[PDB]
Design a protein around this ligand. Structure first.
Ligand SMILES: NC(=O)[C@H]1C(=O)NC(=O)N(c2ccccc2)C1=O
Length: 273
């Protein structure tokens, strides 16, 4: 658009093509997202959701969304760190920061609903920020909470804690926890790991729209097997983020007080930009 000069195509997304652009009025570099009234209302409310761990929506040019620009996303970083693995102190700092952003948005009744590594942006200062926050409501299974896969219509902020659980496990193991090709394959990958849910562990699950009594019954695996060699604090946190039951699932604000974060620090990553 006339205020901007597109500098380079960054890539793509569920919403459209993403470009690095330069504001000609001010020389600021931004991310410009070309999208494919209640939507623009909703998208616009997102302008007021400012937190240091949420990528800032600067304006909405009715659609192009102009966002604050960051050089790298967590998927690129993990891919680069795949041989060696991200050091624990950094995983912990990132998790802590993402929990802060979530707790903020969740306090304002705003959910992401589509968290994935390509949506988590990182800088050289050690920050990590949530991109595309809110855009789903305003208008890749791998990070989807089981309530959504089972057809719940009124899912909650819990869904983002699940997604972040899955990411936390991926940073630690250097492998996606639940890499599904179908909703059913997504769900079976989950069940094969945490076991097939039932009323014991998830009260009301059997009433979910897509629940089937004929689901194969798998036994739960130990978390020490799922995220070796994460320590006890980390595993304990992770198990609470990955509870089937959305009401048992730890809140972002609760997670921040977990003892895994007792010695959280803010390391700086090794970025090649
Ligand atoms: N602000 C953003 O949403 C973008 C950003 O600043 N930088 C960035 O690399 N991306 C991006 C991330 C992953 C794939 C394609 C583009 C953003 O979406």
């Amino acid at each position: 658009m006339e205020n901007f000069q597109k500098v380079e195509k960054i890539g793509e997304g569920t919403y459209g093509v993403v470009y690095k652009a330069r504001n000609k009025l001010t020389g600021e570099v931004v991310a410009l997202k070309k999208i494919r009234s209640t939507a623009i209302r909703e998208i616009s409310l997102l302008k007021e959701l400012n937190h240091p761990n949420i990528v800032k929506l600067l304006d909405v040019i009715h659609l192009y969304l102009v966002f604050e620009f960051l050089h790298q996303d967590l998927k690129k970083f993990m891919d680069a760190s795949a041989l060696t693995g991200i050091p624990l102190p950094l995983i912990k700092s990132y998790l802590f920061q993402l929990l802060q952003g979530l707790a903020f948005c969740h306090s304002h009744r705003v959910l992401h609903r589509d968290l994935k590594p390509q949506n988590l942006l990182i800088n050289t200062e050690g920050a990590i920020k949530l991109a595309d926050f809110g855009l789903a409501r305003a208008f890749t299974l791998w990070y989807r909470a089981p309530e959504i896969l089972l057809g719940c219509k009124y899912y909650s902020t819990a869904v983002d804690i699940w997604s972040l659980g899955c990411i936390f496990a991926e940073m630690v193991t250097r492998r996606a926890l639940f890499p599904g090709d179908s909703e059913i394959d997504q769900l079976f990958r989950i069940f094969r790991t945490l076991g097939t849910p039932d009323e014991v562990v998830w009260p009301g699950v059997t009433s979910m729209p897509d629940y089937k009594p004929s689901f194969p019954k798998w036994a739960r695996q130990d978390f020490s097997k799922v995220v070796p060699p994460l320590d006890e604090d980390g595993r304990s946190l992770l198990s609470q983020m990955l509870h089937y039951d959305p009401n048992k699932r730890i809140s972002a604000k609760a997670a921040l007080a977990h003892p895994f974060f007792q010695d959280v620090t803010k390391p700086v990553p090794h970025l090649r930009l």
